[PDB]
Amino acid sequence: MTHDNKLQVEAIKRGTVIDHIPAQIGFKLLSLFKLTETDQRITIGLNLPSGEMGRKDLIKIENTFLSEDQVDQLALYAPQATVNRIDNYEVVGKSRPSLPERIDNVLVCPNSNCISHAEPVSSSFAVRKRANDIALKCKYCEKEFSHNVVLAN
Amino acid sequence: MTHDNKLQVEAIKRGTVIDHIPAQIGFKLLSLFKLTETDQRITIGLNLPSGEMGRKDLIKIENTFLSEDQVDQLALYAPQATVNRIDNYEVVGKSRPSLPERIDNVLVCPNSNCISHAEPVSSSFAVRKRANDIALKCKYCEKEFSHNVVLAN
Amino acid sequence: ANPLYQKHIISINDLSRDDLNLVLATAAKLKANPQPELLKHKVIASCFFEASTRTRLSFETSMHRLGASVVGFSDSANTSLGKKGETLADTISVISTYVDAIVMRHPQEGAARLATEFSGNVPVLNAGDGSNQHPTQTLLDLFTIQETQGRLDNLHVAMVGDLKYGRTVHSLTQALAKFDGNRFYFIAPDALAMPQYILDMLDEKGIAWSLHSSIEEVMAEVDILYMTRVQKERLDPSEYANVKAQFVLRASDLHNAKANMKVLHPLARVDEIATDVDKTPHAWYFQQAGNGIFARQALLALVLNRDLVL
Amino acid sequence: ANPLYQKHIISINDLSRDDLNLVLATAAKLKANPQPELLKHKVIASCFFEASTRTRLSFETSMHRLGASVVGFSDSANTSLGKKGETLADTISVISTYVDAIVMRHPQEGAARLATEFSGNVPVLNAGDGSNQHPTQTLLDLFTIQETQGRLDNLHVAMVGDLKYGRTVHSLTQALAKFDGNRFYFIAPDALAMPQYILDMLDEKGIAWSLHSSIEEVMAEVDILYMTRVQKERLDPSEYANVKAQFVLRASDLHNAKANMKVLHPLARVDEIATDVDKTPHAWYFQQAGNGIFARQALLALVLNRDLVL
Amino acid sequence: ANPLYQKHIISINDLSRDDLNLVLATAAKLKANPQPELLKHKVIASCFFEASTRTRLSFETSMHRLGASVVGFSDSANTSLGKKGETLADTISVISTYVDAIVMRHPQEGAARLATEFSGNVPVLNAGDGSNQHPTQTLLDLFTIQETQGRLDNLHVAMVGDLKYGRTVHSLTQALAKFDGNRFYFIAPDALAMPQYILDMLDEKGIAWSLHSSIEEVMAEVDILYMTRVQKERLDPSEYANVKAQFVLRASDLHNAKANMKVLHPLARVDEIATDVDKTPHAWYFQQAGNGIFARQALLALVLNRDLVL
Ligand SMILES: O=C(O)C[C@H](NC(=O)CP(=O)(O)O)C(=O)O
Ligand SMILES: O=C(O)C[C@H](NC(=O)CP(=O)(O)O)C(=O)O
Numbered sequence A, B: 001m002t003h004d005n006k007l008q009v010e011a012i013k014r015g016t017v018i019d020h021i022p023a024q025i026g027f028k029l030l031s032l033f034k035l036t037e038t039d040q041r042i043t044i045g046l047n048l049p050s051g052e053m054g055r056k057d058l059i060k061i062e063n064t065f066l067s068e069d070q071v072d073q074l075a076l077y078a079p080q081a082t083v084n085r086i087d088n089y090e091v092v093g094k095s096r097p098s099l100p101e102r103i104d105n106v107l108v109c110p111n112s113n114c115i116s117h118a119e120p121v122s123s124s125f126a127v128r129k130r131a132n133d134i135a136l137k138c139k140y141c142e143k144e145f146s147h148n149v150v151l152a153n
Numbered sequence C, D, E: 001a002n003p004l005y006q007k008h009i010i011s012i013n014d015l016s017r018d019d020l021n022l023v024l025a026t027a028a029k030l031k032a033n034p035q036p037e038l039l040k041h042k043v044i045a046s047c048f049f050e051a052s053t054r055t056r057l058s059f060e061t062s063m064h065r066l067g068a069s070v071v072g073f074s075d076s077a078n079t080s081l082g083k084k085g086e087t088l089a090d091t092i093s094v095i096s097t098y099v100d101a102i103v104m105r106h107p108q109e110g111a112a113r114l115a116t117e118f119s120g121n122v123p124v125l126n127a128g129d130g131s132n133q134h135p136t137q138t139l140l141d142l143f144t145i146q147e148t149q150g151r152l153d154n155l156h157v158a159m160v161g162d163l164k165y166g167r168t169v170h171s172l173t174q175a176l177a178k179f180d181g182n183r184f185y186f187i188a189p190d191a192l193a194m195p196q197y198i199l200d201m202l203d204e205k206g207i208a209w210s211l212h213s214s215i216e217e218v219m220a221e222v223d224i225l226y227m228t229r230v231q232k233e234r235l236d237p238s239e240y241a242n243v244k245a246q247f248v249l250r251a252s253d254l255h256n257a258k259a260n261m262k263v264l265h266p267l268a269r270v271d272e273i274a275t276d277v278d279k280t281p282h283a284w285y286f287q288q289a290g291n292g293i294f295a296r297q298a299l300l301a302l303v304l305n306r307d308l309v310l
């Protein structure tokens, strides 16, 4: 029980409530983590205001909790985002995300000549917080890339 | 406009509201007509149960109006869905999709040899209630396909 | 101005029964009394991005038979569209500013229609857009049928060959489904069946049609035996099974043929029509060809000349 | 078991200084003390999906100098991969059920790595995967540097030519960074510079390296002058500008060099080393190639042999 | 001398049950008891006039596992047949004067047979002649079935894919008809059905076989599910309609199968077996391939060796 204010959010008994999603990154996380499979209520607040951070997206899926590496997967796409695990209308589990050591099968190597494209294998990337441009290393071609180059979406 | 099962916070002055979008359809329509591509406050509620319609969808879109034509574009997915006209928290007038005569853009002609793909020209399909389904006719190549095969973007 | 003045002739679905009548009439009228200066001073484009012998040469002769001038290309291999990466839209953009009318054959369905969106006020004549329509072919076929059956209503038409890609059967059929009493017979291999949109349309107008396994099932009761080539060049590689002709009209099978029954074929023909049929009185394909001059002269006089050429 | 028993030799980044040192010390021993039967009864697949003369022939020659057998293909066009469209994964799988070790050279990066995943317990050796790595090249290089300069520490190595697509110079730097006191002079046309990932590591390592517009400047300062060939087969068309060796070596520029410096090159050499260089006591590309024999013999003995008294 | 001493292994139709059984029993013995010197001093020509990875490499690997030597060509383009226009008859003649046994794979049917006629006393082994036979494939298949089902009698074998041009399924049926109680389920697209000659023999033999439109029906009823690849290189253009695997296997359809059934495939596999199948305990195509090693080793020992104590 409680009531986070400033603007209008939605009621939830138990379930994950992801808050602080950057602008328009909502419609993305919605499909990048295929959240629309859940046949359970899904609240979604787009362009809501937020102090010095103005408009912010916000997704809410009662009775659903992010899979293990999901929050880790949710680091590259929204660094400042916050995961709130709810139960009994309570924030029983506040969690901030950390960039993991490696991203499996979701990313796609930029090297055209990388054997991963052709052959049947799960792409795997080493995550190196190279100062400020997340460094991404391809497990196969050993090439390294600027996280954004790898990150089209 | 009162409504209460679980106390909440869900109101708006102006804007439009597509209510009665049948389950799942709400996400599709999000991309197709690009209703999300705005700085304007949006509030989607996928899978939110209500009445005898039970599982539905609902998109409160702040300070945004659609046209007769625009609303008609929705008939191809959310017919019984009905665009409701908000404004000043007052319900100006409940609209509702009606079969549009032509689907400009969005769709992509399935014929591989159609001039549309190559040339810089917006698609266009003649919509038509064909027997059991809804047949579509390319303006250009003149091929008619069942709405259940023609794609988009 | 007459009904077809400055209008685009993209598809037989756009013209009305009356419009067809005006062409066949003017065609007959023009056949009787040539008018060598009717288009004197005009410059028309013959633009063919796809192989052609009859359609082009006949269209070009027509233009010459009225004093029109011609300019164009036999094949895109040497147009900037071809060697310099250029859109068809830009090609037609620039060309519509030189000539008075554009005639074009293209490999993709919808090219002519496209043209009608950058040709400005200059009209476009669809000489064949992929497997879609071949609208002037129809005018000639009609002109010919009427010439040999006396009418265009209450006829029996057997269409053999490739009806799927056969643009001549698409136009022609939507054309004959505008008159009354014409019953159709479709004889084609399942993979090259007549497209659904034409059958929905036949059903709609209450028109009757029927499939058959062979010409025999229609030979003694068809007035028009429209034979067609197999569109080898458009066939999906998944359908190469039907590359060679499944039905060969040999002169012998015209043994129980109705007297007025004629055999038509837009050409070119491969092996579907044996050369001995060339000697039976039903064979009318080359007469068919020759008629192209009249239907085509007719159409250009109607689109480029405000007043009915008399 | 020894350190590299049954291990995959995929990339220098995966080996350690001691690992490297074990190869050379071993190589040294095989070089002066033959072992005709060491690999008797072993069957080694020599799978080259890309051109080769030195790498394939040296390797197979080694297999033979140890009593081992070789089965293989020097063209992926006659396999069932390049004909029946089989995936490499399936090719590596079936083959790993026949042989004892697989030697592989492939067109794309990560190809060796991927095989380790489908080869079960069969050690895979990377004869070169795209423009990523070429480990055995480096083992033969380290040995040549060591036997001529008596040290792998505090050297002055200059690398010239295509440093971007050069898999040989990627494997060599990561190796020479394992040792102490090495200073790297990088001489390449900008479109073909050393990748950033390799440099970042040199920095992380605290290693001195510099850029230069010509050998002239570092010439009387280097110990090793590693020359490379422009990887023509890999350049993108936008890079086609560099297909001509921009920095070429003639006997003339070897004038002020240290009387101990050697000129190495993985070969083949296009036109980057003028033949006159071949007679100067500095040219060491052919003795270097000769060393591939002892380096690979050592690697094969170590990967397939547990204990090894020599 | 033993039963297959110096004999040609041209077609399963020429071997007998006992013959087959001698191979497997032998294979069984070689599989658990190596013979490094059994073929010492023998020189075997591996002549492949058509693509290969498993058949050629397994065979040559076997030659080596027995102390034999291999001379050969993996491309007929570099021979004097594909250049100087020599006949195969002349090629088989000169070669039969150098080697002890010839292994051959050829583009056309009857190629192996023809060689027996010009090879003098040199035994010829058919690594595959067109789309006729592939005997060694069947020996390795019979062994895999036997070692997993413990019997070659009363089995339930379903054959799927290109049954017409599949040389592997021609050799396998004629084999399994030699045993008792086998029931065959044939699942193929009509243009690629089992040839009539093979069926006539099944009938003559009094053997139960049936046709089916999908695995679904026989799935929970088979012991062996032999999958095959559409022989793309052999299809006539009219058949090009079938170049896409029409019946594909996913882990999902293996749900009600007998917990003892195995899925075999000669490979390479195009897209007829989804990868998820690879992890089910039913997938046995890679262990099957592994067996080619012991099957061919046995065949070679038997053909070249008179008496053989093991
Ligand atoms: O080509 C055919 O088979 C029929 C038809 N042919 C013609 O119109 C005559 P041409 O192709 O010589 O101009 C067409 O569709 O182009
Ligand atoms: O190709 C080069 O020039 C460098 C290097 N060269 C070699 O390995 C020699 P080879 O191609 O004769 O085996 C390589 O990576 O292939």
Ligand SMILES: O=C(O)C[C@H](NC(=O)CP(=O)(O)O)C(=O)O
Residues within 6 Å of the ligand: D080, D084, E051, E052, E053, E054, E055, E056, E128, E134, E137, E167, E168, E228, E229, E266, E267, E268
């Ligand atoms: O080719 C096939 O798919 C079946 C069968 N396959 C094999 O023998 C395997 P390979 O072509 O790798 O030697 C054949 O007859 O070649």
Ligand SMILES: [Zn+2]
Residues within 6 Å of the ligand: A109, A110, A111, A114, A115, A116, A138, A139, A140, A141, A142, A143, D110
């Ligand atoms: Zn990569």
Ligand SMILES: [Zn+2]
Residues within 6 Å of the ligand: B109, B110, B111, B114, B115, B116, B138, B139, B140, B141, B142, B143, C110
């Ligand atoms: Zn179209």
